[PDB]
Write a protein that binds this DNA or RNA. Sequence first.
DNA 1: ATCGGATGTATATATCTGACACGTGCCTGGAGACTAGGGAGTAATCCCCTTGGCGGTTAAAACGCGGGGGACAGCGCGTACGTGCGTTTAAGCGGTGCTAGAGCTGTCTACGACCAATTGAGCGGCCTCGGCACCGGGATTCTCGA
Lengths: 98, 98, 107, 107, 93, 93, 82, 82
Amino acid sequence: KPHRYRPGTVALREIRRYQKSTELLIRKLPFQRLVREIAQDFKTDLRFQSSAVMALQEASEAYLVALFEDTNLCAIHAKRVTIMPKDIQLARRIRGER
Amino acid sequence: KPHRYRPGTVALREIRRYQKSTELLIRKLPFQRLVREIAQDFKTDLRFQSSAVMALQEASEAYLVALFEDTNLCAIHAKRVTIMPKDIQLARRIRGER
Amino acid sequence: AKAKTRSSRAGLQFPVGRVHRLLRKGNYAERVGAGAPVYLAAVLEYLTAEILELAGNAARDNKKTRIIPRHLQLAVRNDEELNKLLGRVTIAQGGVLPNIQSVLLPK
Amino acid sequence: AKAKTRSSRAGLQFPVGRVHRLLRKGNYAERVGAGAPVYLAAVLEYLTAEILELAGNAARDNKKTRIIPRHLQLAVRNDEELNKLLGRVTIAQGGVLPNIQSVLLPK
Amino acid sequence: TRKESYAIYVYKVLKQVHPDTGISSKAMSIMNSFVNDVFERIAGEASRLAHYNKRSTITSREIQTAVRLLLPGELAKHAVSEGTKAVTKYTSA
Amino acid sequence: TRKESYAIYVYKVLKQVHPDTGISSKAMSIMNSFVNDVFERIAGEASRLAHYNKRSTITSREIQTAVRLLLPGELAKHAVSEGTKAVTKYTSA
Amino acid sequence: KVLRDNIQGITKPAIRRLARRGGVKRISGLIYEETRGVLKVFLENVIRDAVTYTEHAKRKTVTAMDVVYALKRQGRTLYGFG
Amino acid sequence: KVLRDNIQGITKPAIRRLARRGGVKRISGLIYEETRGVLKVFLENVIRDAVTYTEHAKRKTVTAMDVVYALKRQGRTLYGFG
DNA sequence: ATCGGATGTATATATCTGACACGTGCCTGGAGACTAGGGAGTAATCCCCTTGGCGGTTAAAACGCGGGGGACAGCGCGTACGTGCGTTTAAGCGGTGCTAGAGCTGTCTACGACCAATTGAGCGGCCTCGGCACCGGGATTCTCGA
């Protein structure tokens, strides 16, 4: 008979190993293309350092995991294990991002 | 027969008039005594400007109503009209105050 | 040789001399550009115009000639970009702009 | 003409002369206190010592001779005082310290 | 003690925008403190960028760039245009 | 083009604390950037204070005061001690 | 003249007044003292830092500009006091 | 070479990977695009400000020190890039 | 509540290496020595804000007091979400090749720096008076029982 772990369990171990790991979790090229797309909005044909864009993606992902973290916390205060967009919105609200 | 307004209603009007009013809502002398008590902890027998302590109390109360405000908001996300200490704690948490 | 203020030649109201004085006394650069105080003072005059105009709007809305800090706080929390500029700033005698939450309403 | 650097005169490592030149070129004050570079560099020496020490603690806690930025993140997140010092600061290749909330565990 | 402020120019530009209006001296002091705040902000940012540019000369280009860094959207745009017009006027003579 | 750093000094203090433990260049430059940031922190703060004192000179008392402003509690205490030590060791020169 | 326990000098009516200003309807008791603590903690910093200024100011009285520069350094700047 | 729609280039698996790193168990769909938006909005500032630096830098390529000073000015400073 | 099986994870091992510790020759910032000014430090003076107390008031706080209102606990269901397995897909290595643009040096020059001579824009100080704050009273409108 096929076995399937209970829900979250696999995701739980994923959480554990991700707090274990430290490297990026975003594919480089898509992020870079997104950055250049954003750039051409303000000015077209602008070049970048690989170090620069690595910094962009690292700092972003840091802000992003922080947002995910405190939104997780808020959802704890929301007594749910599922996340709700309003949690993120109000988190930014408390983060003065509104 | 004696009349009593339904709950909150009087407090609701209080909210309305307080958003209407702008002056302080803390008695001056108690706040000042508290400030001097706090001061003697770091150094005893220190004098103050009335302007200085007025600034202290105004800025405090501002921070305090901001905390009450976003904790109200969080409690909205908590789907309650009653406030809970955990709301304040986690608000400070999002406010980076932990 | 009659001495006219440089702000006159700039056609502005804030004293660019005092500006450049604070600049040199501010320890920002070894030597300040000529038109830099002019430019920044112009920016300052413009933003002051904006804020004072908003304040006058609020005060006249409240049927008030003398403009109290409450009007200014209200205008501050009424301009989104200005608020963004000043949301990190606290305001004496500001109070709170009237904000009512939905679930707060009775039925 | 015997030479002796101010760092040796303080028996420390951080370059008092270099940091003095730096603050001079930093345009903060007209004159300077000659001992202020010594003092500040000593403070830097101290704080750097603590942070690198905690970093090495994590490193050999992980059998790691050469310290990795993850060690740095863990160190700066463990100590309350240093974390408070660098709360809104971010670290390259930092990651997140281990943290699982109570209700996250299944019962 | 000779203390310097700007409330006179506040009254001036007020009449320039609202001639029939009064102010609380409290509010004037608040506005002046705000003036000082924005001034120190822009000055520090300009000095910092010039340091990044290793420049010892803070000029109007620095001014405009730092305002753009600070002010958002149309606020920044209008401010840039105004400073530009004013420096043009001053340079015209 | 000569680019100054403190990798020498950070490695020195590393050995002084951990002769055994190594170091990565990434974390090295991290340390360097960090110390630059905190040095600019203290520099700006002390300059701001002295400007409040309107004192064109920047001395060690300013440094002590401003680091006390900067550091969370006991660190500063510890900190200032060694700092004092330093200047004492340097005043005793 | 050694002071004490002015923290409870903060009246619960005052706290609820501030809350109503913040637009709050229903409140629990557990908040107030908790609130107070925070209050203390909050001011816990500034005064010290303020007198720290006064520390370097070499003066016995404490001024507004102290807390001005504190809130500035605390990123909570205020206007209307020079 | 006009770019577009790389925002959806952010994979939902990537988003949930970041969430798991943040220690999240159950997630809804409505988040991701919302998330993306925020992401955009977030970076919406920095690059501009960054190139603003590059603006004053009078250069065509954009450097790390740009975003360094941005995050600094954005109060989100980062280490390890000079 | 246990045991068995599945699975996922911590370990030892081997070697590869490329960062990395290490050492160089060469450069210039740092040290060393000398001169000036003048910011800073000290002191006597004035002021004058503060800190202290005293008495009367009441609005405000304390406290009590129902009591409806919601916090909360539980309970049904269902839809949305983990999961494991499919599928296909761009991501990454890597290596190539061009140069646009950073990034460096060498001018030369306009440009504040700075000082000196001049002063009127501005600021402390002094009337002054009118929106404004307070008050009392009348009329309006929400609200809670029909």
